[PDB]
Amino acid sequence: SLIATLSFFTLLPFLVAAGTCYIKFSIVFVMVRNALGLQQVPSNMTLNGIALIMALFVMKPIIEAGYENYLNGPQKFDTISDIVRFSDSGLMEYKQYLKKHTDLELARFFQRSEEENADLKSAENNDYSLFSLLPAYALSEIKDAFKIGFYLYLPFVVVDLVISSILLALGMMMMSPITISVPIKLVLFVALDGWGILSKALIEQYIN
């Protein structure tokens, strides 16, 4: 019954890109591009490519677990057994990760939503099925990523306020401070080691 495994493989990387990471990094990078003026990066090329690279990068530990247990075997050179424990154990790994970062509030509200969960009486979070687990995790990750990105946001707005206040204290009302902000922002963005530190912050103490 290899059919479903490979068809859902053709389907799945989209759902994965919506499933663990790839939310937070793309969000933060768009927040960064909302400063500095223009897009300043090609939305059709750069930020999404970076998102994919860093995404597989960060998932490499979960993929390592599935690589030892699941992935290495379906390499058609091992002629692996039909997928019974591959699905269940990869779901268990995804479960442990998801429950690392999913709220219970979302779990119970979505449980009342499915109305299979209400009749089935699910108590353990491992007894919540993967399909039920996914969107709650997505929403929780959205909230955390959003919090992180706007706490990032605050200082640049402080700088813009400073530039305006100075000009208007001198009375230079007719000016586009944004452009004068354009260089200064980047300075901090680079001068604070902020690019590398942001990447490492998200990366290392996202997973740990």
């Binding site: 003026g37 223009l38 586009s176 944004i178 452009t179």
Partner: protein
């Protein structure tokens, strides 16, 4: 049949604010085969078609034809657009004069209602009808062959009465708005503490809307006049 296809498809796409990207691309493609399967008929030529179809050079000619009409036919709408544009310049839109914000937002203010009014107004007499009649006239003039573009080069270099008709429409508007701005200056001279953004903007906005009312009526009649003018220009250009 392809030749008329790439005379018409240029027509349809090149002429968007008559038939635009609001229409799904799957509905902008079939009109080509429609109008062509109409037009192409009675041109029954059975000859030996070149290796690789050297008459691809003929294709070049056909494309240009469609494009011509569209941009020239864009003059009417645009004169109205220009009218609306300049008026909102003295009211609100020109505050995007500054280094690049997010998108051209203030395009949408006023001129788009003019675009809708002008595009609807065609449909009393004809929306796409006169364009296609002139195109059939071009079919009569230049059906096809190697001699591809007679005098198209100097036909292209031409003059269009864009701002001429814009002024014909908006003369008293612009003069009165100039006078009102000078009245704002007299208000400043009366008291040097006005900080015009504290005062002027509301007044010029309200005045702009009132004048747009009376000029929409004058627009109806000047529109029929403008339609006749552009018809003459197109007759000249396609016959030359």
């Amino acid at each position: 049949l392809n030749g008329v296809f790439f005379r018409l498809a240029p027509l349809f796409f090149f002429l968007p604010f008559l038939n635009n990207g609001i229409i799904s691309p799957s509905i902008r493609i079939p009109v080509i085969f429609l109008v062509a399967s109409g037009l192409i008929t009675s041109g029954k030529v059975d000859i030996g078609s070149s290796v690789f179809e050297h008459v691809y050079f003929l294709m070049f000619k056909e494309i240009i034809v469609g494009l011509l009409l569209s941009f020239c036919l864009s003059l009417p709408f645009w004169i109205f657009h220009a009218v609306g544009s300049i008026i909102d310049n003295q009211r609100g839109a020109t505050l995007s004069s500054s280094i690049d914000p997010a998108n051209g937002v203030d395009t949408s203010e006023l001129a788009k209602f003019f675009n809708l009014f002008s595009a609807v107004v065609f449909l009393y007499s004809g929306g796409m009808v006169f364009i296609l009649e002139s195109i059939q006239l071009s079919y009569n003039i230049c059906p096809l062959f190697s001699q591809c573009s007679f005098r198209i080069s100097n036909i292209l270099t031409f003059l269009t009465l864009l701002a001429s008709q814009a002024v014909i429409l908006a003369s008293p508007v612009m003069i009165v708005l100039l006078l009102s701005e000078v009245l704002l200056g007299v208000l400043s001279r009366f008291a040097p503490q006005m900080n015009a953004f504290s005062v002027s903007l509301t007044i010029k906005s309200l005045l702009a809307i009132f004048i747009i009312f009376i000029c929409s009526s004058t627009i109806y009649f000047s529109k029929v006049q403008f339609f006749l003018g552009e018809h003459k220009f197109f007759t000249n250009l396609f016959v030359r």
